[PDB]
Ligand binder design. Structure first.
Ligand code: HEM
Ligand code: HEM
Ligand code: HEM
Ligand SMILES: [Zn+2]
Ligand SMILES: [Zn+2]
Lengths: 106, 106, 106
């Protein structure tokens, strides 16, 4: 997918999570987030087009999606286990990851 | 691209790390491995074609490559600071993750 | 080698990061944490001595351990970038992962 569509999917589904009624809905938003973050991994952002793929910038760029995928995964488990409230909390906190990569490369 | 191709890339570069000349050939081969493993992220292996993308088997499957990439990133950091022998050792012990997944899904 | 020992190394270097002045001191302490975590993550802890390597309990433990490994990586990136203060904030931010895993498995 386009990086840009991948982020819309991240943004949209996080909101779906903040507003969810039950576990089924959070878990579904999390899955979709996982899909998008997995796909984004290999993307080159506009701000790093003049950067070599094996370069520190692209290295740290990729790692951002690694972290996010692990967090979504942890959060996805809380959801599977029916823990709506804490799943929503994990979901929240992975925003720090969105910001960390955003501050730098967006 | 293909799951098959990704594995050939994995296998080849593991041999490339074992024979490595210097830090850079080690780093370059590890980079290729991470990109191949992330390409495989969302591939669907023959043995799990009957299984829902939301099943424990696929969960287990995608998670392997996440562990792997992590292990690769860790080796990469060893190489970055010029501990080639140590980076080469982690690429050896990195086979435990390969095997773990083949055992279940190949 | 053993969990205990690596956990001390982990504990001690976080207090070294909190008391650090320069980016290099943070980088080294994070590097020692990287190393402790590299040698620890696959151990079975006292409280899961009964459960086997591929249960839900060991899978969760390994993941949170990998989350931790991934936050040390992020923090190490920030240090190489010489962003001293935000490497430290990231070393702080990683106490929650420490805590999430102790709360289930210590
Ligand atoms: C779930 C967490 C995340 C959310 C909610 C999020 C949200 C967004 C949104 C809404 C945009 C569009 C901004 C615009 O309208 O111009 C965007 C763009 C972007 N994001 Fe994220 N993001 C997340 C995680 C990440 C991560 C982890 C990375 C890097 C590893 C990243 C890298 C980027 C980049 C480079 C752009 C610019 C896209 C472009 O200009 O083509 N984002 N993100
Ligand atoms: C760097 C470590 C790894 C190496 C060197 C490696 C190597 C290989 C090789 C040589 C094959 C032979 C199949 C062929 O080429 O036709 C294969 C197949 C396969 N591997 Fe891996 N592998 C690794 C890691 C993994 C991991 C981590 C997973 C799961 C997370 C995995 C899942 C599979 C599956 C499902 C197949 C069978 C697919 C097919 O035949 O279409 N492998 N691998
Ligand atoms: C920076 C992060 C962490 C710090 C500073 C830390 C610190 C410590 C300390 C001080 C101990 C007690 C050691 C002793 O008195 O022998 C300990 C033990 C332990 N830690 Fe951590 N820890 C961290 C992260 C983690 C993580 C991520 C996990 C699992 C994923 C984990 C699992 C355990 C377990 C199971 C023990 C019990 C060992 C025993 O008493 O046998 N820790 N840790
Ligand atoms: Zn899991
Ligand atoms: Zn790195």
């Amino acid at each position: 997918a386009d990086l840009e569509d991948n982020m819309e999917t991240l943004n949209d589904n996080l909101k779906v999570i903040e507003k969810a009624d039950n576990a089924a809905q959070v878990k579904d938003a999390l899955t979709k987030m996982a899909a998008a973050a997995a796909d984004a991994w290999s993307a080159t952002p506009p701000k790093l087009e003049d950067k070599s793929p094996d370069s520190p910038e692209m290295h740290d760029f990729r790692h951002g999606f690694w972290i996010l995928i692990g967090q979504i995964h942890a959060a996805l488990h809380l959801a599977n286990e029916g823990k709506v409230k804490e799943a929503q909390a994990a979901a929240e906190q992975l925003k720090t990851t969105c910001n960390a990569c955003h501050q730098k490369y967006r």
